[PDB]
Design a protein around this ligand. Structure first.
Ligand SMILES: C[C@H](C(=O)Nc1ccc(F)cc1)[C@]12C[C@](NC(=O)c3cccc(Cl)c3)(C1)C2
Length: 375
């Protein structure tokens, strides 16, 4: 059993269980804009409506679920405001009425003032029927950007992979208990169970093709998820009016912000953050874009003794095989993600009258994973 301080759910893992859909009535002016982004963006009315907002206090967001919903609401509004219709006409200043409360709320939750994975995947969902299972057909997102953006497909399939991975996350304490207690058979079983759940998560990943089309993803959704760190469109970053006087750079939404994208590498001692390269740098930097509880969880996993070293030390083929089953499953996940980036970013980019940096990142992550096979 994982400690409650890490905000990991037995059923949905790093996802926020049963996210709030509605804020207090005090925040109706925020909520109307967020719920009407498709129409407000298209009609050129989004920015004016944000500019007409009064500065609202974050004091009436009293609980974590309300604070996370507000982050999702404000984050989606902020991306809509910065990127506009998604045609390259950009806003370089976020007005104070929205920028102040967003930054204040962000500071409170220990997250940067930009839409992150934890917002648009982990807290951006509901069950259609709460008495039916966590499946795509019984689920919907809370917020989208544009009609036809495939935000439902992209966010929900991401979430469903997170949920599939929850089954592996709950075995992590069994792994560390087994090592401490010197329980070889228990450890072997635990590793095999993790490998099984990672294999299951890969099959869930396959659903992306059914709900996302390349053109819409590349030309629309990818634009709204983009940030302002090393972005030539906002080379100095974004001005958060009334919070900082000088523009600040923050990275956009990335798979690297998923805690399951990192935690099994950490568990298995695949030192993805070692060696000094770009990939290692990015993975560490993205921990600050995760909720602090999840950042803290990764820290705790790092601080425990090494599973890899344990298995390596024992002279035990069965244990090595079970460890390698986990490593193999991670390789297959990276390989699949590469195939998706090819179909959804590289090819559309080629047909545009992008993706290589993400491809190179994922190749490095995969290569490092492959090299951890014990054999
Ligand atoms: C494609 C999708 C994605 O990028 N979503 C995304 C990005 C940016 C956003 F702003 C919002 C959503 C994925 C990659 C994925 N998870 C793993 O690849 C993985 C890696 C190791 C272990 C496990 Cl269990 C899973 C599915 C998240």
């Amino acid at each position: 059993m994982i400690s409650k301080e890490y905000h990991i759910d037995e059923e949905v893992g790093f996802a926020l269980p049963n996210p709030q859909e509605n804020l207090p009535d005090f925040y109706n002016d925020w909520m109307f804009i967020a719920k009407h982004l498709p129409d407000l963006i298209e009609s050129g009315q989004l920015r004016e409506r944000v500019e007409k907002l009064n500065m609202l206090s974050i004091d009436h967001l009293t609980d974590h679920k309300s604070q996370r919903l507000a982050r999702l609401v404000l984050g989606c509004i902020t991306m809509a405001y910065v990127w506009g219709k998604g045609h390259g006409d950009v806003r370089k200043v976020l007005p104070r009425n929205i920028a102040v409360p967003y930054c204040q709320l962000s500071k409170k939750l220990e997250l940067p003032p930009i839409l992150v994975y934890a917002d648009c995947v982990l807290a951006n969902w509901k069950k259609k029927d709460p008495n039916k299972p966590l499946t795509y057909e019984n689920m919907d997102v809370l917020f989208s950007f544009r009609d036809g953006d495939c935000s439902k497909g992209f966010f929900l399939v991401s979430l469903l992979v997170e949920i599939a991975a929850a089954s592996a996350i709950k075995v992590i304490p069994t792994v560390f208990k087994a090592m401490q207690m010197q329980e070889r058979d228990t450890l072997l079983k635990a590793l095999l169970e993790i490998a099984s759940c990672l294999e299951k998560a890969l099959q869930v990943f396959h659903q992306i093709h059914d709900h996302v089309n390349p053109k819409a993803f590349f030309s629309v959704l990818r634009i709204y998820l983009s940030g302002w760190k090393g972005n030539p469109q906002l080379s100095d970053g974004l001005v958060y009016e009334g919070f900082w006087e000088d523009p600040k750079e923050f990275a956009g939404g990335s798979a690297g912000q998923s805690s399951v994208f990192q935690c099994f590498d950490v568990l298995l001692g695949i030192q993805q953050t070692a060696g000094g390269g770009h990939a290692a740098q990015f993975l560490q930097d993205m921990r600050r874009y995760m909720p602090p509880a999840h950042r803290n969880f990764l820290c705790s996993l790092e601080s425990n003794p090494s599973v890899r070293e344990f298995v390596l030390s024992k002279g035990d083929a069965g244990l090595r095989e079970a460890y390698d089953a986990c490593v193999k499953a991670l390789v297959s996940l990276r390989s699949y993600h590469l195939q998706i980036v090819t179909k959804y970013i590289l090819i559309p980019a080629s047909q545009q009258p992008g993706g290589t940096d993400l491809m190179n990142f994922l190749k490095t992550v995969r290569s490092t994973t492959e090299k951890s096979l014990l054999k």
